[PDB]
Design a protein around this ligand. Sequence first.
Ligand SMILES: [K+]
Ligand SMILES: [K+]
Ligand SMILES: [K+]
Ligand SMILES: [K+]
Ligand SMILES: [K+]
Ligand SMILES: [K+]
Ligand SMILES: [Mg+2]
Ligand SMILES: [Mg+2]
Ligand SMILES: [Mg+2]
Ligand SMILES: [Mg+2]
Ligand SMILES: [Mg+2]
Ligand SMILES: [Mg+2]
Ligand SMILES: [Mg+2]
Ligand SMILES: [Mg+2]
Ligand SMILES: [Mg+2]
Ligand SMILES: [Mg+2]
Ligand SMILES: [Mg+2]
Ligand SMILES: [Mg+2]
Ligand SMILES: [Mg+2]
Ligand SMILES: [Mg+2]
Ligand SMILES: [Mg+2]
Ligand SMILES: [Mg+2]
Ligand SMILES: [Mg+2]
Ligand SMILES: [Mg+2]
Ligand SMILES: [Mg+2]
Ligand SMILES: [Mg+2]
Ligand SMILES: [Mg+2]
Ligand SMILES: [Mg+2]
Ligand SMILES: [Mg+2]
Ligand SMILES: [Mg+2]
Ligand SMILES: [Mg+2]
Ligand SMILES: [Mg+2]
Ligand SMILES: [Mg+2]
Ligand SMILES: [Mg+2]
Ligand SMILES: [Mg+2]
Ligand SMILES: [Mg+2]
Ligand SMILES: [Mg+2]
Ligand SMILES: [Mg+2]
Ligand SMILES: [Mg+2]
Ligand SMILES: [Mg+2]
Ligand SMILES: [Mg+2]
Ligand SMILES: [Mg+2]
Ligand SMILES: [Mg+2]
Ligand SMILES: [Mg+2]
Ligand SMILES: [Mg+2]
Ligand SMILES: [Mg+2]
Ligand SMILES: [Mg+2]
Ligand SMILES: [Mg+2]
Ligand SMILES: [Mg+2]
Ligand SMILES: [Mg+2]
Ligand SMILES: [Mg+2]
Ligand SMILES: [Mg+2]
Ligand SMILES: [Mg+2]
Ligand SMILES: [Mg+2]
Ligand SMILES: [Mg+2]
Ligand SMILES: [Mg+2]
Ligand SMILES: [Mg+2]
Ligand SMILES: [Mg+2]
Ligand code: NA
Ligand code: NA
Lengths: 102, 77, 255, 12, 88, 50
Amino acid sequence: RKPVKVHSRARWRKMKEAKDMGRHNGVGRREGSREARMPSKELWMRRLRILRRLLRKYRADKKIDRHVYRDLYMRAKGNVFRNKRNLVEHIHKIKNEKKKER
Amino acid sequence: PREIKTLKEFLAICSRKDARCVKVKHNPSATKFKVRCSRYLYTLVVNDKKKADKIERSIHPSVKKIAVTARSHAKTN
Amino acid sequence: GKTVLSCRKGNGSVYQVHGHKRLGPAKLRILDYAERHGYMRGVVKSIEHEAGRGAALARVEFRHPYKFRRVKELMVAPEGMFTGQSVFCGQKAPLAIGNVLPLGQITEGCIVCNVEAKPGDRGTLARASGDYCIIISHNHETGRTRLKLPSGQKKSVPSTSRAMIGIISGGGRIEKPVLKAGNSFYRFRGKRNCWPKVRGVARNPVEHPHGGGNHQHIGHPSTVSRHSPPGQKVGLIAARRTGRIRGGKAVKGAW
Amino acid sequence: VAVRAKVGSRSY
Amino acid sequence: AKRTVKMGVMGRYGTRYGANPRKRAKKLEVSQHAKHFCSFCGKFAFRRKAVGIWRCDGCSKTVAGGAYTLSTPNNSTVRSTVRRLREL
Amino acid sequence: GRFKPLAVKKKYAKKMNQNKPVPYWIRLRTGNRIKWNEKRRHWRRTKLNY
RNA sequence: CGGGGAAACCCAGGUGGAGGCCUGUAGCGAUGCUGACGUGCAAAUCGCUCGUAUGAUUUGGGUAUCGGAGCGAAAGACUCA
RNA sequence: CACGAGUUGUUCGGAAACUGAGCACAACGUUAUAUCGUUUUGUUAGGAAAGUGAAGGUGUGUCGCCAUAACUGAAAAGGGGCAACAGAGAACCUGGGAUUAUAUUCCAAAAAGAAAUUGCAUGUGGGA
RNA sequence: GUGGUAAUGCGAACACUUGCCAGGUAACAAAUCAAUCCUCCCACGGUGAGCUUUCUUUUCACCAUAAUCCACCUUGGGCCUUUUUACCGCGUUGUUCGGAGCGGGGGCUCAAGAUUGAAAAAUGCAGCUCUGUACUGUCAUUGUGAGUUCUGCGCAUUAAAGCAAAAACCUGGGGUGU
RNA sequence: CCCAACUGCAGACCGUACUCAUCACCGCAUCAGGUCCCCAAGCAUAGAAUGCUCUGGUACAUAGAGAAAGGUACACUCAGGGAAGUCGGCAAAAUAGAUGCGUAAGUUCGCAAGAAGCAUUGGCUCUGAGGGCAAAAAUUGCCAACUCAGAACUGCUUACGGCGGGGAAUCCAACUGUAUAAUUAAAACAUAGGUUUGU
Ligand SMILES: [K+]
Ligand SMILES: [K+]
Ligand SMILES: [K+]
Ligand SMILES: [K+]
Ligand SMILES: [K+]
Ligand SMILES: [K+]
Ligand SMILES: [Mg+2]
Ligand SMILES: [Mg+2]
Ligand SMILES: [Mg+2]
Ligand SMILES: [Mg+2]
Ligand SMILES: [Mg+2]
Ligand SMILES: [Mg+2]
Ligand SMILES: [Mg+2]
Ligand SMILES: [Mg+2]
Ligand SMILES: [Mg+2]
Ligand SMILES: [Mg+2]
Ligand SMILES: [Mg+2]
Ligand SMILES: [Mg+2]
Ligand SMILES: [Mg+2]
Ligand SMILES: [Mg+2]
Ligand SMILES: [Mg+2]
Ligand SMILES: [Mg+2]
Ligand SMILES: [Mg+2]
Ligand SMILES: [Mg+2]
Ligand SMILES: [Mg+2]
Ligand SMILES: [Mg+2]
Ligand SMILES: [Mg+2]
Ligand SMILES: [Mg+2]
Ligand SMILES: [Mg+2]
Ligand SMILES: [Mg+2]
Ligand SMILES: [Mg+2]
Ligand SMILES: [Mg+2]
Ligand SMILES: [Mg+2]
Ligand SMILES: [Mg+2]
Ligand SMILES: [Mg+2]
Ligand SMILES: [Mg+2]
Ligand SMILES: [Mg+2]
Ligand SMILES: [Mg+2]
Ligand SMILES: [Mg+2]
Ligand SMILES: [Mg+2]
Ligand SMILES: [Mg+2]
Ligand SMILES: [Mg+2]
Ligand SMILES: [Mg+2]
Ligand SMILES: [Mg+2]
Ligand SMILES: [Mg+2]
Ligand SMILES: [Mg+2]
Ligand SMILES: [Mg+2]
Ligand SMILES: [Mg+2]
Ligand SMILES: [Mg+2]
Ligand SMILES: [Mg+2]
Ligand SMILES: [Mg+2]
Ligand SMILES: [Mg+2]
Ligand SMILES: [Mg+2]
Ligand SMILES: [Mg+2]
Ligand SMILES: [Mg+2]
Ligand SMILES: [Mg+2]
Ligand SMILES: [Mg+2]
Ligand SMILES: [Mg+2]
Ligand code: NA
Ligand code: NA
């Protein structure tokens, strides 16, 4: 029984390393639409799931109370925070204001 | 297949009239006693090598004891 | 020539009712001794929709009057009927919506549906969605009730005929424009093979009296006699008038 | 993966 | 933000059935897809499930009603009339 | 395909059995007129359609 | 979720995924070249081009309606070249 | 072309054994003429189409009631069938060195084996 | 028959029951999102093969576990008990839910899984040995991404469209028996 | 007689080869036509487009020699002009992806619209941003997958495949649909709407 013919993936792996470093993905290399390459629904789902997970962790850890949690939950559903860092900054600002008032 | 845990249950299964033969399987870590009954194959697993060897003896000599070994193609057609 | 389409449909053929998804005929209870002398109490168990019918149907459960079993009636539901409602049918049933009473036991001016033209035919009048009858007057010399039909005609039926209190459910259906040929496709999917409709003047003269000509026109008056043989009786059949009516709409039908 | 790869670091 | 100026749910139809037929169908569509008050259970939870069938999300009660609204004006008049005739 | 009724299978079996050459010793008989079967059937020429 | 407004309501950013919606495969068709062929691969095919492609969509198997009759979104179309 | 071979099943597909769009035997009616019509909107036929058997009585066997045979019946409206190898339903699945050709179909005592399911029976253990 | 406040649990008389009734299963449904078996890819190691002026800790292949059972940590539903001045809170990518009982604590149960074993290595596949369909001995990779309609999934879609029925089977209600 | 754990015996009938098609079916044939269902790899790419490839399959289509004219092509190019050709821009050419700006009359307010237009696209080396899981935890450690931006350097012969030309109007039909199998796809038919008639 002769062996199967070779179908090598070395070229593809070198190209994959290059594309990991950021090569070969520019304006002239894109054939599909932006939403085809990276749907906005997928990005929104990821961002909102991150925000809700962070809010649940903060509520369970008692860094925020249930009222601040509800306000931030509705604001996160309302596209107020661009990423996790923006939400964390808002939380810290609210906590500082509460500390001053208290 | 049914797993029997107690040596008493193993003796009861071996005492049955439908116990055609007993297959002794020697694994590197344990010994298995597979009893070919009418409907189910009952297996007794013994971790202790010495206790397993003791169990292998004092089995009813009426039953047929099979030493499970790999059988090659030339060995069997 | 060849047989006109209006005559071919009388053979049945591919023009019959699409009844596979239908639930069966909708009727009142059998007019029995309990109805005639007392009343039967039923429970509305479900309110279902049948293909090809604009009005809702009600499944009402009664105890069998003579055996140890339960009987489920399928009635045309009046508007306001709900699951779990108690439905009373008989002589002594109270005057309330959803109850079935003899016409003579119903006071004048009451709105009724599912009217029996004959005593015991289990409801043949005022059955389409949104339709109802009006009880005009009771005559005791003849023992007949005079009621107003949905078409505007007034007919007299025996006071022992039964009717339901209220209007038929599902009213207002024809107030919504269809907007699409596909919607008519789905509407007539549950009824029969009658859609789309091809005009007579769009056909050839071999198959329709209106067919033919170098222009699309009826070359003869479309008002045809009542005595025209089949194949010839197309168009406006035995019309008393034509045009845009122009005034009070006369009550259609015979005298 | 966690840190983006550098061409220069390929030396070592 | 507001996505259409005048046509609401009728925006699904594009430009292709006429302003007035769309306007007439709009009111009945909006009514037939709305949540209607349930006299039982006191909730705004009545939804249409096929023409003339209204089921409440709260108490799970199913009612026979109008084609595109839970109760027609004729039904209210008939209910009042029948109640009055009962009291006579 | 796989399905056939047994009656059809037996008709096909009989037609398979009839599809033979004439024995040689038939041609040597006295007054013989038969040379070939002349009712030989090939599956690619004429169809039984059972 | 914001921003205005006394109110009526209005203005913006997201989410969502509607439509006999669009570009396009398969599929289902057949516009033009009046292209090929036109004793053909073919008693209607081939090539490119082209229509539509979630809908009144396409399709298998079963059923039902026929000869002055049947069936036909209608061309006297189709009903085993 | 000639000769000689090859298709293996409790579980796979079908039938046994479901209903559907439907068909049309009986029945009735019609027709000079059945080679015509009706025959599922729970359903043939002016139409007496059930041959089954709840409880009783009597007898056998089983026990301390159950099963079995007979006489009197409570109840059961609406005759008999067909129509799906893609709907319903359906208890087997791996390994093989087991072929020239079949295999979830062949393999034989270490069944290469491991099961799942029917029907009927015998003991065992409990109740009648 | 018998436990538990309850959701509901318990199998060798918790016996029978189409005499008779009443329900279930059979049984049917979009899109979004999350997806199972499985496929592909990457990482990590083993075994063999390939290439090797030079380079490539490299290229390629393989690394499997059927039905049937036994025992019993996640995910998602339904529900029970308690606290219930709970009205703002919970939650989804998403068009919502709550005194007709949200949320929290603790449970009951269902569905899909995971895991422990029996089957099962005695099999399969690669080489390898050396001494003929031979024979001994070695291997026989456990973690991720992208797809995947099994599933969650329905009183479930546009709807003047609302998505077959039966056999067969499963429970109960009464009853018999006990 | 009933039950539930075993056990013993027995488990009947038919189908089963092969094919399912550029040769096994229909088309007079091993006919470029037609014919239902399941499984469906790698790379590029939005990709079941298209191009190439490992596994499986195939080298079967009468061939050899071979720059006549004239042909067919699911083949190209042509200086200068640019529709003067022709009934007619028929045919061909042309436009193309993605991204950022920008987009008129008219309008049933939905559209028109990809209107029209104007820019940028390579390679390489970098820099930011976007997460998961553990123990002012606003901190410490580990770790995966892809992207989207910005920057410098360095290039183009503008260089695979695939992939709208656009605008100003007139006449018809509202639209999507259907339709003369084999010369007519339309303005015809249908269609929402509208109106009559019988009952
Ligand atoms: K005419
Ligand atoms: K869409
Ligand atoms: K016919
Ligand atoms: K005929
Ligand atoms: K609350
Ligand atoms: K056309
Ligand atoms: Mg979006
Ligand atoms: Mg018409
Ligand atoms: Mg014409
Ligand atoms: Mg003509
Ligand atoms: Mg005429
Ligand atoms: Mg005209
Ligand atoms: Mg005219
Ligand atoms: Mg076949
Ligand atoms: Mg042939
Ligand atoms: Mg045949
Ligand atoms: Mg479309
Ligand atoms: Mg389109
Ligand atoms: Mg030509
Ligand atoms: Mg020629
Ligand atoms: Mg196409
Ligand atoms: Mg031959
Ligand atoms: Mg032979
Ligand atoms: Mg007959
Ligand atoms: Mg009939
Ligand atoms: Mg039928
Ligand atoms: Mg009758
Ligand atoms: Mg049958
Ligand atoms: Mg089937
Ligand atoms: Mg079978
Ligand atoms: Mg074979
Ligand atoms: Mg066997
Ligand atoms: Mg269901
Ligand atoms: Mg397994
Ligand atoms: Mg789904
Ligand atoms: Mg076979
Ligand atoms: Mg075969
Ligand atoms: Mg095939
Ligand atoms: Mg050929
Ligand atoms: Mg022929
Ligand atoms: Mg062919
Ligand atoms: Mg392709
Ligand atoms: Mg491709
Ligand atoms: Mg190859
Ligand atoms: Mg040739
Ligand atoms: Mg060749
Ligand atoms: Mg030139
Ligand atoms: Mg040029
Ligand atoms: Mg030039
Ligand atoms: Mg120019
Ligand atoms: Mg000119
Ligand atoms: Mg000229
Ligand atoms: Mg052109
Ligand atoms: Mg403008
Ligand atoms: Mg324009
Ligand atoms: Mg543009
Ligand atoms: Mg048109
Ligand atoms: Mg279309
Ligand atoms: Na079905
Ligand atoms: Na037209």
